[PDB]
Design a protein around this ligand. Sequence first.
Ligand SMILES: *[C@H](CS(=O)(=O)c1ccccc1)[C@H](CCc1ccccc1)NC(=O)[C@H](Cc1ccccc1)NC(=O)N1CCN(C)CC1
Ligand SMILES: *[C@H](CS(=O)(=O)c1ccccc1)[C@H](CCc1ccccc1)NC(=O)[C@H](Cc1ccccc1)NC(=O)N1CCN(C)CC1
Ligand SMILES: *[C@H](CS(=O)(=O)c1ccccc1)[C@H](CCc1ccccc1)NC(=O)[C@H](Cc1ccccc1)NC(=O)N1CCN(C)CC1
Ligand SMILES: *[C@H](CS(=O)(=O)c1ccccc1)[C@H](CCc1ccccc1)NC(=O)[C@H](Cc1ccccc1)NC(=O)N1CCN(C)CC1
Lengths: 215, 215, 215, 215
Amino acid sequence: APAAVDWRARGAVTAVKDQGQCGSCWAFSAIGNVECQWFLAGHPLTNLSEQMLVSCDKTDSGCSGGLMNNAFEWIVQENNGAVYTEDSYPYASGEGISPPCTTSGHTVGATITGHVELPQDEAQIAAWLAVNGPVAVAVDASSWMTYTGGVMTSCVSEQLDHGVLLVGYNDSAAVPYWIIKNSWTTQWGEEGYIRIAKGSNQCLVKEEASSAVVG
Amino acid sequence: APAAVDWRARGAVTAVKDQGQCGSCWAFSAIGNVECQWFLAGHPLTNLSEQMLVSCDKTDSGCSGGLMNNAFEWIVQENNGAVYTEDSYPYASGEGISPPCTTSGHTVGATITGHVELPQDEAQIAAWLAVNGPVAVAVDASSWMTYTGGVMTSCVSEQLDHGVLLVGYNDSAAVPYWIIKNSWTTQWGEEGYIRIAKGSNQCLVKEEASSAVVG
Amino acid sequence: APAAVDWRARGAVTAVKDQGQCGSCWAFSAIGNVECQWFLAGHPLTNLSEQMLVSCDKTDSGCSGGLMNNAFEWIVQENNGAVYTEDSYPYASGEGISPPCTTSGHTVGATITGHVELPQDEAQIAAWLAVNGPVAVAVDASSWMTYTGGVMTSCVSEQLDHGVLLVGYNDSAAVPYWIIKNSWTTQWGEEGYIRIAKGSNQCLVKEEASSAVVG
Amino acid sequence: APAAVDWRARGAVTAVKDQGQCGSCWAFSAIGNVECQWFLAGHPLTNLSEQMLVSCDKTDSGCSGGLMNNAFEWIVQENNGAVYTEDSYPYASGEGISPPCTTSGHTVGATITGHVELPQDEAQIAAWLAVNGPVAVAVDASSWMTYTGGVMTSCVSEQLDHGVLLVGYNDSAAVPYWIIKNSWTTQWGEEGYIRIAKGSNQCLVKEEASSAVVG
Ligand SMILES: *[C@H](CS(=O)(=O)c1ccccc1)[C@H](CCc1ccccc1)NC(=O)[C@H](Cc1ccccc1)NC(=O)N1CCN(C)CC1
Ligand SMILES: *[C@H](CS(=O)(=O)c1ccccc1)[C@H](CCc1ccccc1)NC(=O)[C@H](Cc1ccccc1)NC(=O)N1CCN(C)CC1
Ligand SMILES: *[C@H](CS(=O)(=O)c1ccccc1)[C@H](CCc1ccccc1)NC(=O)[C@H](Cc1ccccc1)NC(=O)N1CCN(C)CC1
Ligand SMILES: *[C@H](CS(=O)(=O)c1ccccc1)[C@H](CCc1ccccc1)NC(=O)[C@H](Cc1ccccc1)NC(=O)N1CCN(C)CC1
């Protein structure tokens, strides 16, 4: 695999978002992935709708949490692959209240056909990401509360509690790392990103990695 | 049952606490309940150790959440019924990182023999509370992000995601209410407290109500 | 016992010192204690000689460590209670090399008759300190490396590796604490001092507490 | 035996590391030795995990010190001979706080079958090193605080307090010397290395010499 990949440098990643006071991390992770995958299939980079999942995906729990794999399955099984644009279904849950699901008035921004669940193996995840793009991953982010920068080497890795987006890695660095897009504004971490050490299952990063399929 | 009960007025409730940047609400709810039950058995009101649970209760998940019933069971089945004083096992997870469990150097503040799981019935919970004191309850607190006061009447009631403590109710008010101790400092809500309407299962307040037993 | 005691406020404690690049913490702890005890017996507060112990106490290991209880025993058993002044036997080990022991040319600043080893009980240590003054204590100080201030509530308490001086406590504070004099200059911690939480055997503070006797 | 051996010139020695503000020298010495022995068995030179030992070896005391022989025994008796790669269990104790042991998420980099404890004889250690490679040694390093280069001839040799790695010697020099890898960055001494005189038991270098066995 390549020494280092940063999908942000390649123009594949939209701006860092703000889930606000809502446990919709799972929706931001799934949607960030679909955004990247749509772009990598040759379409323009476009912001897609977290609100669509938060309000409409009833297999997950809105501001009280969910699972990216559930979200992908809902998009395919219950929404026939359609993901609305952010512009036509904008985020409304920043104060913890999710408005009822609506269908009419929204514009489809991307279509997915399925999702893959990747091996629980960091080398394999890295090799897949290099060829196929950013990967939705569950993490234990309980120890991320005071992160301001650097490569994290003792992330508490005990309970998956968060969803985020793997956008790259660097295997040449003195401490190899993953690059991760968070959804806690650009004021958090490194302009909204975190580097965690790569190769030691920091934050349980390898446990539940997946991606939408546009193919 | 009485028209209104307020266990705070009776000196049965310790100060409002701060869980900080840690999903330890479950522990704050269990411990609040034990503090109150211990006082109600004739003992001085004493602050007890949330950290004991967060660090040592491996049937729950520290800053990534847990269940008050699991917490009551762990105390009895793994800790000989013992609950340490706050001052002997001080809270240190406020930045999201829990110290490792230590079995040594702590002082028993209260002892419990078990717990009771109350009917999913607000009237019966009220009656139990009037006689037996504050009750640990799970709630949907997803819609509590902007609350500064008054009686909450439109609580989003979809997913249990939080643990708090019922400390009283008022059936005489124009809109009858529960009085609830939160663990988000005295800055949140009504000096740390929330009133939610009583009789409409606001926030799913009746779904998982329980209390330690000191007797 | 008193709510709070600070022997510094009472004029019983000499300036914060610098052991330099030498593991003579044990000598600084023992000597700080003798300094305080001499003052409290009605003598002027005077700086005494760490170098005397580092060079001459062959039951301990100079810049490679020692035990305060050994140091007190050496002063009594091998030096017939005598402790030289700092001025006449000044500290010379700041670069890790301890000069050979000398006897002539030094001036006795204090005399001790023995030492007491206090119970492994923080309440008891506090009550003794209130009446009898600062107490030499062994601690696990491995987790003190980035301490800049505040009351420490999750001190790693695993292995006694350091000697320091208990100069006070405050039981009225929201988080009760001990006040401890370190020997790492005034640039470290709170002008050379640390507050650790009191009542939870932080840093194993209760395990090996002792004092010289001037009586 | 050869006139001079330098295992660095032969590519058998990894980069000089930094223990940071943690008394983990014992672990750096044990791990340095394993790295070298693993390479010398025909395998690629690989950085291995000091953190594995610091966190998980409970027969030693993490940042408060330990013994290389204890470390070799723990690897074999408690870890099935396995030593994880650095990149799979990265060092995170540099500020003096060791993360808890994790048994999961690591990758075996080397395996050992035991260790040998060498004679307290510098000539025999030299001969063993020429044939079998770098040797873990305990030293009195109390007098190493100002060292910037040259051959140390007056090392304070009183108390074993440090663990380092013999990587070579030169019997041809006007003053014969040992070559020693320290773990205090490349900023200390000779790009991280110290030369001490050979033949006078400098720093007590002959007292506790040992090496893992890969065979
Ligand atoms: C997003 C995580 S967060 O809020 O950004 C955060 C905050 C602080 C520290 C770490 C993370 C949500 C939070 C959900 C929540 C909100 C309020 C109260 C309780 C919970 N986390 C999730 O959605 C996780 C993500 C996840 C994805 C894949 C695998 C494992 C976990 N899932 C989750 O919380 N749930 C809970 C209940 N639901 C039915 C199952 C999934
Ligand atoms: C406390 C709730 S909170 O953080 O104060 C909060 C914040 C905003 C809105 C609502 C509530 C914790 C939060 C746990 C968490 C942290 C970070 C990421 C994900 C989750 N909530 C719990 O501990 C709940 C309480 C509960 C008790 C009884 C019944 C139902 C819920 N339990 C909980 O989250 N879990 C999740 C995982 N665990 C293994 C099972 C219990
Ligand atoms: C002082 C501690 S320190 O150097 O200020 C320090 C630094 C960083 C973190 C924590 C503490 C000394 C250090 C001795 C040392 C130096 C160099 C290499 C190895 C060790 N510590 C001691 O002197 C302790 C104190 C003590 C007192 C009472 C009870 C328990 C411990 N004692 C000690 O180290 N030893 C070692 C060998 N000696 C024969 C027995 C006591
Ligand atoms: C590493 C040595 S160091 O910190 O790099 C150093 C610094 C200055 C001068 C000399 C050396 C550690 C230091 C441990 C320590 C930290 C803080 C307070 C007290 C001690 N030293 C050790 O781990 C030594 C090494 C050793 C190996 C083999 C034989 C003899 C010594 N061992 C050690 O200190 N201990 C103490 C306690 N432990 C239970 C037994 C081994």
